[PDB]
């Protein structure tokens, strides 16, 4: 009637939980993390970069 399309798939369906942003959405292993959001909190999750 109003205020809803079919919203099931594509970038419009889903957003970053931390900052509410669709762009740059890391969905590997079911993160649902926007990249700007993901890199700074990556050490606190577990991810430690080397080589």
């Amino acid at each position: 009637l109003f205020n809803t399309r079919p919203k099931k798939f594509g970038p419009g369906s889903r957003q970053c939980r931390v900052c509410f942003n669709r762009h740059g959405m890391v969905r590997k292993y079911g993160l649902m993390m926007c990249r700007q959001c993901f890199r700074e909190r990556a050490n606190q999750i577990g991810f430690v970069k080397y080589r």
Binding site: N3, T4, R17, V18, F20
Partner: protein, 94 residues
Amino acid sequence: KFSLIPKANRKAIYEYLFKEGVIVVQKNGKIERHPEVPVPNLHVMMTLRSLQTKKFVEEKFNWQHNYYFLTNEGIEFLRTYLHLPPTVFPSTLT
């Protein structure tokens, strides 16, 4: 969903907050009513937009999810509306 929440379902928000003393609501408007209390999710956001701006409840954000605490003057208000016996729910009690 949409429109003003019934006045029975106003007390459905308050009587949950009267017993437990916590109520957290997801920021999203189109999201399903919050797990726990069977109402629209917008109506929980509207009633605690209403509550915070007359003090009583202590709002605290992070993470879209809005983690409310209920103060000493807050438990006076609900009891009056609720009609609950005085000293009914101390947070000091376990």
